Amino acid sequence: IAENEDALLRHLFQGYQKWVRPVLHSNDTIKVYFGLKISQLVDVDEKNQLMTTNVWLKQEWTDHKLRWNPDDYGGIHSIKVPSESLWLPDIVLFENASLMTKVIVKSNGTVVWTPPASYKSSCTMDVTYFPFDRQNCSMKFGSWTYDGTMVDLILINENVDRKDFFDNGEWEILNAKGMKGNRRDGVYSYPFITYSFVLRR
Ligand SMILES: *[C@@H]1O[C@H](CO)[C@@H](O)[C@H](O)[C@H]1NC(C)=O
Ligand SMILES: *[C@@H]1O[C@H](CO)[C@@H](O)[C@H](O)[C@H]1NC(C)=O
């Protein structure tokens, strides 16, 4: 086989600077579509009010530097590229608790990144219900480096993605909904997404 896959890569990352936002015009914000997918609830530590989860952080955005006509490159329309090479919006889980997988890049600039993660975030037993088999657990995600001027978050679904979720014997997910906030400290606006989990038993 003969791969102009190597030519596209050399042409795509020639003078690429992963630290410059890959916008066309410098006035532009980069829109990052975001969604949380849960694989399983690993453990609910009722003592320390903590929760550990296995999740994927679904991210998608446009990198206007990484755009090509497939006709020039043997009809390639998509390629897999290491996340370490790309500009990233640097979305993190806020209350410290995102492995560097590879990214998919498409000839129109769309980048799809879904890195897996394992987190231990804080919980809160619901005292309104007796017996006490409810817990309120929140996960808050947003860019660390870029304010809303430079990265805007778009929440792709009101619900956490659970199609591939593993029900663990000991707790059940009553609800898991995401909502957008735009609140952070300083003379800067920072958009974020809060996911609220209601766990039973
Ligand atoms: C690029 O093409 C894909 C289909 O492969 C599509 O899902 C995506 O919306 C396109 N990107 C843009 C920025 O239109
Ligand atoms: C816990 O979550 C439930 C469901 O969203 C809500 O009705 C309740 O007000 C919350 N209370 C606390 C203390 O978290």
Numbering used by the authors: 1 to 97, 104 to 207
What does the paper say about this structure?
As shown, the structure of β3 ECD adopts overall the same structural architecture that has been presented previously for homologous proteins. Its main secondary structure elements comprise the N-terminal α-helix and a ten-stranded β-sandwich core, from which several putatively functionally important loops (loops A–F) emerge. On the contrary, loop C was found to be the most diverging region both in terms of sequence and structure with regard to the other nAChR subunits.
Nicotinic acetylcholine receptors (nAChRs) belong to the superfamily of pentameric ligand gated ion channels that are widely expressed in the neuromuscular junction (muscle type), in the central and peripheral neurons as well as in other tissues (neuronal types), and are naturally activated by the neurotransmitter acetylcholine (ACh). The ACh binding site, usually referred to as an orthosteric binding site, is located at the interface between the ECDs of two adjacent subunits, one contributing the principal or (+) side (consisting of loops A, B and C) and the other one contributing the complementary or (−) side (consisting of loops D, E and F). While β3 has for several years been considered an accessory subunit without direct participation in the formation of functional binding sites, recent electrophysiology data have disputed this notion and indicated the presence of a functional (+) side on the extracellular domain (ECD) of β3.
